[PDB]
């Protein structure tokens, strides 16, 4: 229920209805962030968005003398929401510093449930 | 606080990418609304021009039917309403009401401009 009123929050998603988030929660993707693991890069193509559970991710710059951090994101968090609109460019990067639950949104997804 | 607003204008889609620093900009270019219980945010299909985010409270969204309001579902904390009117021509694709007493962070499309800029 709580993946429900998370989806709820998101801007695309501002006019759906219940029934449209429930085809939401369930035909996105659940997964679980292993420790280290990044999710995208910078410069990176999209197709799906991201949608913070429980747990930390972490948005960084990259740079000739290092990485460069950004900010820690945390439950509630939307990364690449415009990539359900178009084909984006990841803005920056991100990784899972700790065990990450995650609801993953691809384009594809998101469009059929328009037509409902 | 200022500290709680920053932290929730950062889970927004759009602000994603913001550093620290844009995210303060936006927290303090925002415009704070206390709204009552009852009262409308705005018609639906009314011109569009700001977003508004909830910070706490419940405002029902509804459509405008033949015969009264048809409710659509209640959002709460962190929702935001008419994030798409900052970056493109829209119109408001629901009403809102306040269901009790609720604290909103309004957004206009000039100020999200600016922190581009």
């Given at each position: 229920d709580?993946?429900?009123?998370?989806?709820?929050?998101?801007?695309?998603?501002?006019?759906?209805?219940?029934?449209?988030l429930r085809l939401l929660a369930?035909?996105?993707?659940?997964?679980?962030?292993?420790?280290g693991r990044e999710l995208f890069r910078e410069g990176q193509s999209a197709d799906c968005a991201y949608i913070i559970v429980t747990g930390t991710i972490t948005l960084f710059h990259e740079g000739d003398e290092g990485r460069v951090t950004i900010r820690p994101v945390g439950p509630?968090?939307?990364?690449?929401?415009?990539?359900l609109i178009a084909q984006t460019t990841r803005l920056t990067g991100a990784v899972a510093d700790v065990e990450t639950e995650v609801i993953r949104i691809s384009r594809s997804i998101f469009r059929r449930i328009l037509e409902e």
């Open positions: 709580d993946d429900i009123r998370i989806l709820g929050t998101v801007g695309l998603f501002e006019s759906f209805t219940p029934e449209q369930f035909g996105a993707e659940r997964l679980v962030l292993r420790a509630g968090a939307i990364l690449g929401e415009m990539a």
